[PDB]
Nucleic acid binder design. Structure first.
Ligand SMILES: [Mg+2]
Ligand SMILES: [Mg+2]
Ligand SMILES: [Mg+2]
Ligand SMILES: [Mg+2]
Ligand SMILES: [Mg+2]
Ligand SMILES: [Mg+2]
Ligand SMILES: [Mg+2]
Ligand SMILES: [Mg+2]
Ligand SMILES: [Mg+2]
Ligand SMILES: [Mg+2]
Ligand SMILES: [Mg+2]
Ligand SMILES: [Mg+2]
Ligand SMILES: [Mg+2]
Ligand SMILES: [Mg+2]
Ligand SMILES: [Mg+2]
Ligand SMILES: [Mg+2]
Ligand SMILES: [Mg+2]
Ligand SMILES: [Mg+2]
Ligand SMILES: [Mg+2]
Ligand SMILES: [Mg+2]
Ligand SMILES: [Mg+2]
Ligand SMILES: [Mg+2]
Ligand SMILES: [Mg+2]
Ligand SMILES: [Mg+2]
Ligand SMILES: [Mg+2]
Ligand SMILES: [Mg+2]
Ligand SMILES: [Mg+2]
Ligand SMILES: [Mg+2]
Ligand SMILES: [Mg+2]
Ligand SMILES: [Mg+2]
Ligand SMILES: [Mg+2]
Ligand SMILES: [Mg+2]
Ligand SMILES: [Mg+2]
Ligand SMILES: [Mg+2]
Ligand SMILES: [Mg+2]
Ligand SMILES: [Mg+2]
Ligand SMILES: [Mg+2]
Ligand SMILES: [Mg+2]
Ligand SMILES: [Mg+2]
Ligand SMILES: [Mg+2]
Ligand SMILES: [Mg+2]
Ligand SMILES: [Mg+2]
Ligand SMILES: [Mg+2]
Ligand SMILES: [Mg+2]
Ligand SMILES: [Mg+2]
Ligand SMILES: [Mg+2]
Ligand SMILES: [Mg+2]
Ligand SMILES: [Mg+2]
Ligand SMILES: [Mg+2]
Ligand SMILES: [Mg+2]
Ligand SMILES: [Mg+2]
Ligand SMILES: [Mg+2]
Ligand SMILES: [Mg+2]
Ligand SMILES: [Mg+2]
Ligand SMILES: [Mg+2]
Ligand SMILES: [Mg+2]
Lengths: 155, 199, 135, 81, 88, 131
RNA sequence: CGGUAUCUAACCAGAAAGCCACGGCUAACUACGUGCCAGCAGCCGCGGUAAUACGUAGGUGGCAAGCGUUGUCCGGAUUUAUUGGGCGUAAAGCGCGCGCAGGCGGUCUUUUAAGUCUGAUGUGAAAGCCCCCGGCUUAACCGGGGAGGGUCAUUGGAAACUG
RNA sequence: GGUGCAUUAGCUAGUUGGUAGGGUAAUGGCCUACCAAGGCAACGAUGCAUAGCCGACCUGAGAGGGUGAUCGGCCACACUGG
């Protein structure tokens, strides 16, 4: 796993005596083989917050299908105010994506994808929306078995 | 040549040896300037891509307006964009002269191609950007193929890459075939060049 | 909207507003009318030279000038740099750019271009403020 | 081998004139940007030699040389009355 | 006065003419009826291309050549063929 | 069903898929007859049964779910609608999900999918996307 | 044009580098001076005695015979949303009805061919964008061939959908 | 086929059609004598404002948005009116 921090936010709760601050850190974790996950953790110091997120993240792994170093088809993720469409790109074109949507595509091990975030730009929701799109994504052999066909017949 | 300035500090800022291996990073392998012995910093996404374009264009020492132009015409070729963009750079007249061992450094080959000391197919070429093709006899002018500098630069030089055939007796060479992206240094992540030029 | 609702009465986008409205107006004397020409600079004669105080939370004393352009339009400018030779009835060249502190100012006097001169003892950012090479 | 002329069809609208009628021709154009099939209607003038036609008939008209200030079509045949 | 002539192309001090048939009225580089061939006067043995079937079709319709194009149509053996064409 | 019998037929299937129903019935027609059969061919559904009535008869569609209760149809939609019709030239017949789905186009050689519509060099009205 | 392009010989590293940025957006840092003054600013905003934001010097970073500023257009802007948005509380459902034109319209059969799809012929000039070849010492530039581009016309077929 | 305005709703009087003639290279209210009262418009007539049209040019993933300098085609003008 090759964790990459995304945002470190400094939140505060006001108490009768004043304000008590905290740090929330968003971390994306994955290996380049095709598994990726994200997690969040709140603490009182930045190094403490990061450790919690990495521990949390390692329990939410998801799998990405990556035919020919690319995603199979185009999907649109959707979580709350965040929306992100992913579209396959031609070989050697690199990863064309924003801030926190690029982190989950480089960690996942994908090489050639283009995308565009059409909704809000909150980092917490741009990672949920991307992972939601990863769910709707499906390979040819997986579809062929479901429909009782053969991969040759489909294509 | 065109960047008429110090060469060690260019490598030290970027962190790789642009002139072979370790020659300019033996002592003080850190960025130039007042700082550098003090501390380092954290590189952003912009700084990661912009630090690899500068690894190529300072390796061959050609300006930006020419670096960008040759990036577009590599984008009309068969294959992958970054793959093709790096074999065009290897194919300039400067690099081909440097590969054969006629010059110690590209800043010396360029100052050699500039003055007309080399001939391609029996004709003078006074320019360093000549994009040589496959199977062209690269030779030396039959007026200065005895200069001490070029002779001292062959024995003191390295071996020869596979895709060029050279005769130290006849002072001739030729590009037998185009490389396939694994023959050169390959220390540059070519994907960051392509991403950089689309920001 | 439905497709039919959008055939009977289609979509019309909002129109843009220029930030330097006195620069895209020209004049001609024969017809005595204002023309529509976009121009990077204009020149006029400064009628009032002085200072005003900026808005909160800044508190310095900012130098300005009140010029009368070559199309007859009367505008307020700002003199950058440290120290100026401007007086009343001087000829200046002006250009766009709005200073945030000063309320009414929307243009910005270019220094060294006309009767106005460059700043003394400037070493850096010297193409701005228009002063020559010391060497 | 002899070249031909344009021929249309439509509905007589008025006969309030001498030796002429007014046919109307309707077609389904499409809108430029939304691509919806919209009706188009342009109406002509045709030379009625002997006041044959009546209002609301189906007739065919063919192009001729300019016969008057506006009329340049002739009544070729009638179909449904 | 339809006639066949040369229209000048190429860069400065490197002419390249394009054999064309046009009226005597329209500009040198302006509108024409059709293009027939090219003529490169720079390299030593001049390179000239001719249609061989359009030019004869045009000379019959009264399209007299210009001064130079007559020379080009001479070396090509294409203006002799017009002479034997009328006799036959 | 008042303006689109075909959008009604499509939206009944999507409504029944969500609650994981195993069967749905609706009034029949000649064009809804042909759509149901196309689906069966690609294994989107299990079977179609036709029933005679007094007026026009009905139709029963047996929804197909794979093992582990995972839906076979992910979604449908209608492309050419009464308020705006779309017709596709022979080379404009689209690909859905890079061929992982189908498209139902009504060509002059009958109702066909997009796979064999461009194998006959024909086009027509595009009815729906199914994936 | 004009003794112009080009070529050959003798001697010189000798005559030939600036511009703006360094708080973050955004690559790149420390000293001295000033003290809500002088001043900076595209936005967030900086100057009240330790100023990485003002002024100078040192050092760096992007370009380079150029480098910045201003003006104008497209993009980012899904911020007029056909592709591609919305209307309970954020801007947004007429106070409600009767209804002309208009938009849309249940099931089956036969027929037509206006919309729809398809074959052939004519044309959409040259130059320009793109693809393949070649000529200037390369490049820009210049030549040869082609491709693309029309709710385009004439003409022959199909009948699933709208009329 | 390619524009903004309804905070511009009516416009038309050789104007719409016909019978004979004159005129022109040529058909035609193009002009004339007589008869008639037609013709265009919410599918935007009329009026005001603005503008030479195109091949093409800049930007954009595309659909689109903005422009009509250089080069080629067509139009109009030549101090203002006849
Ligand atoms: Mg949703
Ligand atoms: Mg939503
Ligand atoms: Mg990275
Ligand atoms: Mg240059
Ligand atoms: Mg490409
Ligand atoms: Mg590209
Ligand atoms: Mg705006
Ligand atoms: Mg305004
Ligand atoms: Mg400004
Ligand atoms: Mg009409
Ligand atoms: Mg000669
Ligand atoms: Mg010497
Ligand atoms: Mg400054
Ligand atoms: Mg700053
Ligand atoms: Mg400073
Ligand atoms: Mg410096
Ligand atoms: Mg520098
Ligand atoms: Mg837009
Ligand atoms: Mg808006
Ligand atoms: Mg919409
Ligand atoms: Mg909205
Ligand atoms: Mg409102
Ligand atoms: Mg409200
Ligand atoms: Mg209500
Ligand atoms: Mg009402
Ligand atoms: Mg009704
Ligand atoms: Mg129906
Ligand atoms: Mg039917
Ligand atoms: Mg052309
Ligand atoms: Mg052009
Ligand atoms: Mg060449
Ligand atoms: Mg060319
Ligand atoms: Mg060509
Ligand atoms: Mg039939
Ligand atoms: Mg039928
Ligand atoms: Mg038939
Ligand atoms: Mg209807
Ligand atoms: Mg029918
Ligand atoms: Mg226009
Ligand atoms: Mg008459
Ligand atoms: Mg006349
Ligand atoms: Mg009368
Ligand atoms: Mg009336
Ligand atoms: Mg009306
Ligand atoms: Mg007017
Ligand atoms: Mg006017
Ligand atoms: Mg005008
Ligand atoms: Mg866009
Ligand atoms: Mg375009
Ligand atoms: Mg346009
Ligand atoms: Mg212009
Ligand atoms: Mg001019
Ligand atoms: Mg004409
Ligand atoms: Mg004219
Ligand atoms: Mg005239
Ligand atoms: Mg005059």
């Amino acid at each position: 796993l090759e964790e990459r921090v995304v945002t470190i936010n400094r939140v505060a709760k006001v108490v009768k005596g004043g304000r008590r601050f905290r740090f929330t850190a968003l971390v994306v974790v994955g290996d380049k083989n095709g598994h990726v996950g994200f997690g969040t953790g709140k603490a009182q110091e930045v190094p403490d917050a990061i450790r919690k997120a990495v521990e949390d993240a390692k329990k939410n792994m998801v799998f990405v299908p990556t035919v020919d170093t690319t995603i199979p088809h185009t999907v649109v993720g959707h979580f709350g105010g965040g929306e992100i469409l992913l579209k396959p790109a031609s070989a050697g074109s690199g990863v064309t994506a924003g801030g926190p949507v690029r982190a989950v595509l480089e960690l996942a091990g994908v090489a050639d994808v283009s995308s565009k975030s059409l909704g809000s730009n909150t980092p917490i929701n741009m990672v949920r929306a991307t992972i939601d799109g990863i769910k709707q994504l499906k390979n040819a052999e997986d579809v062929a078995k479901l429909r009782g066909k053969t991969v040759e017949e489909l294509l | 040549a065109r960047y008429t300035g110090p060469s060690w500090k260019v490598s030290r800022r970027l962190g790789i040896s642009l002139s072979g291996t370790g020659k300019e990073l033996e002592r003080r392998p850190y960025a130039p300037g007042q700082h550098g012995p003090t501390q380092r910093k954290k590189i952003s996404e912009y700084g990661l891509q912009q630090a690899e374009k500068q690894k190529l264009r300072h390796m061959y020492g050609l300006t930006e307006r020419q670096f960008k132009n040759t990036f577009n015409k590599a984008g009309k070729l068969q294959g992958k964009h970054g793959e093709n963009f790096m074999i065009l750079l290897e194919q300039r007249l400067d690099n081909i002269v440097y590969r054969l061992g006629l010059a110690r450094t590209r800043r010396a080959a360029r100052q050699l191609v500039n003055h007309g000391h080399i001939t391609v197919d029996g004709k003078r070429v006074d320019i360093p950007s000549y994009q040589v093709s496959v199977g062209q006899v690269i030779s030396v002018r039959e007026k200065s193929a005895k200069n001490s500098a070029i002779a001292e630069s062959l024995e003191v030089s390295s071996f020869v890459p596979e895709y060029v055939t050279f005769d130290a007796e006849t002072l001739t060479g030729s590009l037998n075939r185009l490389p396939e992206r694994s023959e050169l240094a390959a220390e540059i992540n070519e994907a960051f060049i392509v991403e950089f030029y689309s920001r | 909207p439905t497709i039919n609702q959008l055939v009977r009465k289609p979509r019309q986008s909002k129109i843009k507003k220029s930030t330097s409205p006195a620069l895209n107006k020209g004049l001609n004397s024969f017809k005595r009318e204002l023309t529509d020409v976009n121009s990077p600079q204009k020149r006029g004669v400064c009628t009032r030279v002085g200072t005003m105080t900026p808005k909160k939370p800044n508190s310095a004393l900012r130098k300005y000038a009140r010029v009368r352009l070559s199309n007859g339009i009367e505008v307020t400018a700002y003199i950058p740099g440290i120290g100026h030779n401007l007086q009343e009835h001087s000829v200046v060249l002006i250009r766009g750019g709005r200073v945030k502190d000063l309320p009414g100012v929307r243009y910005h006097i270019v220094r060294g271009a006309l009767d106005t001169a460059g700043v003394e003892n400037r070493g850096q950012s010297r193409s701005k403020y228009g002063t020559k090479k010391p060497k | 081998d002899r070249n031909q002329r344009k021929v249309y069809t439509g509905r007589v609208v008025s006969d309030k004139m001498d030796k002429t009628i007014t046919v109307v021709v309707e077609t389904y154009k499409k809108h430029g940007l939304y691509g919806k099939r919209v009706k188009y209607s342009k109406k002509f003038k045709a030379h009625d030699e002997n006041n044959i036609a009546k209002t609301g008939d189906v007739v065919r008209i063919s192009e001729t040389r300019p016969l008057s200030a506006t009329k340049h079509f002739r009544l070729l045949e009638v179909v449904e009355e | 006065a339809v006639k066949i002539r040369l229209k000048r192309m190429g860069s400065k001090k490197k002419p390249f003419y394009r054999i064309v048939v046009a009226d005597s009225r329209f500009p040198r580089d302006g509108r024409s009826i059709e293009t027939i061939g090219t003529y490169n006067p720079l390299l030593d043995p001049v390179e000239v291309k001719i249609d061989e079937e359009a030019t004869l079709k045009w000379m019959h319709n009264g399209a007299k050549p210009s001064d130079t194009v007559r020379n080009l149509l001479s070396r090509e053996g294409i203006m002799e063929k017009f002479h034997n064409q009328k006799l036959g | 069903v008042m303006t689109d019998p075909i959008a009604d037929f499509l939206t009944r299937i999507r409504n029944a898929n969500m609650v994981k129903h195993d069967k749905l019935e609706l009034p029949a027609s000649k064009i809804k007859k042909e759509i149901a059969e196309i689906l069966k061919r690609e294994g989107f559904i299990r079977d179609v049964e036709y029933i005679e009535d007094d007026n026009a008869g009905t139709i029963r569609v047996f929804l197909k779910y794979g093992a582990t209760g995972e839906r076979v149809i992910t979604g449908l939609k209608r492309i050419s609608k009464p308020g705006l019709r779309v017709y596709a030239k022979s080379t404009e017949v689209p690909k859905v999900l890079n061929g992982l789905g189908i498209a139902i186009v009504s060509t002059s050689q009958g109702v066909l999918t997009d796979k064999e519509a461009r194998a006959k060099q024909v086009g027509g009205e595009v009815l729906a996307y199914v994936w």
